[PDB]
Amino acid sequence: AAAKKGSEQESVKEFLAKAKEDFLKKWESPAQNTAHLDQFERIKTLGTGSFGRVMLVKHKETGNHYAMKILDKQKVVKLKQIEHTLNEKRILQAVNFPFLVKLEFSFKDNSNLYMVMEYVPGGEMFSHLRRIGRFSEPHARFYAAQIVLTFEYLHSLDLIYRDLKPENLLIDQQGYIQVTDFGFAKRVKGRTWTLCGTPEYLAPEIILSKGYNKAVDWWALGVLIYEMAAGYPPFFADQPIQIYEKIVSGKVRFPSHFSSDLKDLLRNLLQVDLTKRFGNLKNGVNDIKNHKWFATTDWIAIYQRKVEAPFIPKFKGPGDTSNFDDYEEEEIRVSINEKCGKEFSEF
């Protein structure tokens, strides 16, 4: 089944060729400077990172709500994330898939870069997962199927995503996944070397400074599925170094409640040996799609959003943020002097 090249495979191939045509046009001529800060009313912070924050905003002219990522150019420079930030915007403006958050506008001012994306009101998978404890296998399977199709899409465009984790997956009003955080996404044919990601999710080849490819995203998928079904990651400790020792050791233990199909899938994803890792073999993504654990999954129905979600987030009208944690707010200051102009000229 995993090797068989049936008519279904040709349909996927057909779809992906058209998707690549659309992507390359936007890749080669990126949208730039498509809004201004004063067009948006800033409401509330939805998340924070090392070099900025994401805030709920309201677009004045339409009344639509969006999630606006505000990046401090000076902080980006100090953390040596200039190229990664250029990658993030150039890639996100060019992609189009039902499980990828849309970038609606982007622009910059003297101080900051801005990416205005669709607001996804159901909150982070992380929040729901921690609160509930763990997801059932059918629940985790539903989410995992979306990541599988999303990685099939991204990878066909020569993109590596490199930051899969529940914190970067939002749940929409239909209970479907929206992948956010393209900060480490990169278009690369062949090999790359940057040590980036999140410790619990890093493939062993990343931590061992080997040079790596899209197979790191499949390993990260193994970590995500494990964490969703177990309630904890397959490699955890109090400090990152300790996590890395676990990751490289080649040993993984599964909760006693894991189905034997689930265990088998995870052994093939959390496979240190690249000649053996699912997603990285002659059959590519089909080794995953045709695994026993996914027997009940109808891939076309998932793509079409026809499958009933295992839960719908509580929705209390537009602009409601009760699915998100509260963060300290800080006034956006725009310097009277342009910072780091040369470095971000293409943004």
């Binding site: 953390l79 040596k80 914190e167 980036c196 990601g197 999140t198 619990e200 309630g231």
Partner: peptide, 20 residues
Amino acid sequence: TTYADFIASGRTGRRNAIHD
């Protein structure tokens, strides 16, 4: 239990990406 060890650990909150 592994779950109890996880809940008692310092990494059950949001995990930051590593840059440098």
